């Protein structure tokens, strides 16, 4: 009874929240890990194919974003009150190690610095520069809104992600637009339902 209308009637939308950190993946280079949706007790760690949409998996980790850092990759997460720590593999959410005494190490996730390296924006327009011999290949007109450049990969699978409006993300590749995502719907508080629907006697006999 299900297989006819398995996916036809079900209506599921995936919301990842406003992205806080985008970490590249050492293997399968067109893949990233997104830390998003902070709160007082947990955050949402997801994996994301960057040349498409197609969220791969999501997990609600019970650590704040500032407690989640790389190794010295392996994504060490360390509580601060106690020293309960968990090392989780990238590219598969395997609990590589668990412990209570000491964390192995951490490195602070670096800031972008995408200016002075690869980007210059002057005439309401975005130019991608080589580091040296700045011939300014792959220029693109800016969108209407523009906040920042979330992610940028310069090697062969070129991918670029722009945080265009406050909650919208646009993804380009070598530049043509490839995908577009919106997380305006991250938390629904209340609802209301709107319905849509259609729209002497002898003279009656004759008509």
């Amino acid at each position, epitope marked *: 009874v299900f297989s006819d209308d398995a996916f036809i009637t079900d209506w599921q939308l995936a919301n990842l929240g*406003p*992205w806080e950190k985008v970490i590249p993946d050492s293997r399968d280079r067109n893949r990233v890990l997104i830390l998003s949706n902070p709160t007082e007790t947990s955050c949402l760690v997801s994996s994301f194919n960057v040349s498409s949409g197609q969220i791969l998996f999501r997990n609600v980790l019970p650590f704040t974003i500032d407690e989640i850092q790389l190794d010295s990759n392996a994504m060490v997460c360390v509580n601060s009150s106690s020293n309960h720590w968990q090392k989780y593999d990238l590219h598969d959410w395997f609990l590589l190690e668990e412990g209570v005494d000491n964390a192995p190490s951490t490195t602070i996730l670096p800031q972008s610095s*995408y200016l002075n390296d690869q980007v210059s924006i002057k005439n309401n327009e975005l130019h991608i520069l080589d580091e040296q011999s700045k011939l300014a290949e792959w220029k693109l007109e800016l969108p209407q809104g523009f906040n920042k450049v979330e992610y940028f990969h310069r090697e062969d699978p070129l991918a670029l992600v722009l945080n265009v409006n406050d909650t919208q993300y646009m993804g380009f590749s070598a530049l043509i637009p490839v995908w577009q995502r919106d997380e305006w719907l991250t938390n629904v508080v209340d609802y209301a339902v709107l319905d849509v629907f259609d729209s002497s006697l002898w003279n009656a006999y004759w008509l």
Partner: antibody
Amino acid sequence: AQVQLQQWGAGLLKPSETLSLTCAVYGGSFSGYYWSWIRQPPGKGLEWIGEINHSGSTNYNVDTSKNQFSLKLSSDTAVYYCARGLAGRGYYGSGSYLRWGQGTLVTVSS
Amino acid sequence: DVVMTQSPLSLPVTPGEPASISCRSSQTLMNRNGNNFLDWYLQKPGQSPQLLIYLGSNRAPGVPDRFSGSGSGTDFTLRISRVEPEDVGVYYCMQALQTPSFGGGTKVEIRR
């Protein structure tokens, strides 16, 4: 204009004590911008940079709470504004302050 | 350190005609890539300031098409193609290379 900043603080201060102000953010992406304080003293001027980062990288001419999204300042009479700036460079910030705060008034009187 | 000078301290202009404000700096604001790091601000009376032009030549979101910017190095210029009585308030420069200053205070005064 959904990401807008709300302020708390104090109105009356005698000379020589510290001035506590607190912004609070109501939008996305607390990490990716430099959040700065600016003064306007009456007398037709503005000058400050009190920059901050999500990983605390204070750049004076500004305490941070990543738990609740509220930077905090503790230091003359003026109006004090929050800000939010582009973060192109690594540890410096790049100005371009959009989404200012509503602004609090601080009078240092006897 | 860096000092910003705005040429006209008061510029009354009738609505309809172009207007321009100039801005000069001691040091150079020319980044290696080609980013200029100069912003132009407008403060309406009794209001928080607004952003008009945000990386020396761009235009901020939610701003009319009337405003434009130009310049490089040590000189910069804001230009309004058509002035309207909404465009009243104080106009400020800012440099973002090192420790922004807010040197300025132009005072467009359209009641001549």
